[PDB]
Write a protein that binds this ligand. Sequence first.
Ligand SMILES: N[C@@H](Cn1ccc(=O)n(CCC(=O)O)c1=O)C(=O)O
Ligand SMILES: N[C@@H](Cn1ccc(=O)n(CCC(=O)O)c1=O)C(=O)O
Ligand SMILES: [Zn+2]
Ligand SMILES: [Zn+2]
Ligand SMILES: [Zn+2]
Ligand SMILES: [Zn+2]
Lengths: 257, 257
Amino acid sequence: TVVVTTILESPYVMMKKNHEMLEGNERYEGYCVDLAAEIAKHCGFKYKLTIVGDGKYGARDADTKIWNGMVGELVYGKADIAIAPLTITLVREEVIDFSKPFMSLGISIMIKKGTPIESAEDLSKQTEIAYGTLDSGSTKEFFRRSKIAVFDKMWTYMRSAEPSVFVRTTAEGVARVRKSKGKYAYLLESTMNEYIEQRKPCDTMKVGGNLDSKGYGIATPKGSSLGNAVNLAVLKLNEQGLLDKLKNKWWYDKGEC
Amino acid sequence: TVVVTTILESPYVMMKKNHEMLEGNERYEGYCVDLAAEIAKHCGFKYKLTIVGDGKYGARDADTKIWNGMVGELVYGKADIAIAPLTITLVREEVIDFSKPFMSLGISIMIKKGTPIESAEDLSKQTEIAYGTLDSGSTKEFFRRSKIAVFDKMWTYMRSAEPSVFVRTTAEGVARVRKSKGKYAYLLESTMNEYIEQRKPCDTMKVGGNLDSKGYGIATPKGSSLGNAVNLAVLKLNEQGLLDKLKNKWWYDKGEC
Ligand SMILES: N[C@@H](Cn1ccc(=O)n(CCC(=O)O)c1=O)C(=O)O
Ligand SMILES: N[C@@H](Cn1ccc(=O)n(CCC(=O)O)c1=O)C(=O)O
Ligand SMILES: [Zn+2]
Ligand SMILES: [Zn+2]
Ligand SMILES: [Zn+2]
Ligand SMILES: [Zn+2]
């Protein structure tokens, strides 16, 4: 039985409303729960879904050099595979193996409906509408290291804006956009932006094209015997149109706006 | 070094805005962070604050018979003491020890300012203004088992109300009160009600007296070498007026309304 590690993040993995009457894998539902079933079917294995112990995705402590979250569970042998919205990054690819991406994404802009902003360039040219990102992570790092004029201008602003424009969590960034009467725009992953856009109170909107490109991949321990099969399954699913179908179902078919 | 388990719940434990520049226990602030320092001071031990991995307080699954949250961390040896807003209950006291209560609370009513409701009696006499609680937990169970008229009347209503008046999380309940335009009242722990009342946009109000009584307590494993000292520490802090100073500090001095 393959131990799958995942994380509670809507609409990827959520508790069914009646989860208390259920048990095992049936307690969960969502995009990744559906994806796990597909992968298992094509790779030919039985599995058990478990929620990552520390509820984190995967980062290496600069001091101890220890990995936490799902990457950690894979690295230290606590799980056999990770199916969740885990970004494929150089540092993680150095310690675990990733499948080809099952979803493509990029940094995007979230605004409260009605805000007169249509792109990052628009944000960089004005001042009365503040904007920020998570206080740590790839999105913040993207701006900090950019050599592109527009993003350099945005980073210069964000790094010294007052009050601070950074937030610690997604919920924090979304709430700020929603209570700032259009005076705050949040920079986040397009997938989350797109999801929130389809959820009540339906007062946010994703604008402009993505600022960068990346994707989520299924992860397995280095030199795992599941790596090859899982990679082929992800390609087969995309070719069959199933990845797009799954995305449309959990983002739009179940939308509230 | 004593391992302390706690949970990110405002204003009990929160991440300082400059946490990325701080280390260890200094990354956190809040009522329980202050309480932990006092308890360790008077008990004479060194400690390290850790956040419970699954973000839960403590319940036993009737299936697996496994304890989750902070109670689980104590019973399975992951932490030596739990310092958080953990309600003292019979089922929990059966596996861990609780200090005398450091804070008293009870079920209360939260309304959007403007709602013509001043008590549980007012709610029980009508239906235009819907009211509910978490879909699971002590508050819901309180109503389900009550033999008291008014509470029986309230439960008789809640159990058959449509759409469902129950919510999955505190955030959901609070958000529902704020966006229901005076048509939903939320029943919750007085401590959280009093806290929300002091947070922007200052659009909610706590009405009526508590419907019941209970307390939060510090938890330690059975046979812990710290059990006795922790208990005496709580009593001394109460007698010194320290517990009330901390409540006033985190609820009102730092209040925004
Ligand atoms: N892919 C990330 C984890 N992850 C997943 C989904 C998601 O929506 N967001 C962030 C959304 C936001 O920007 O608020 C995120 O950070 C990782 O690999 O660590
Ligand atoms: N004391 C509970 C945990 N706990 C702590 C703080 C709190 O505000 N609320 C609930 C607030 C609300 O009713 O929405 C709560 O359920 C336990 O011991 O499990
Ligand atoms: Zn298939
Ligand atoms: Zn941070
Ligand atoms: Zn003292
Ligand atoms: Zn539930």
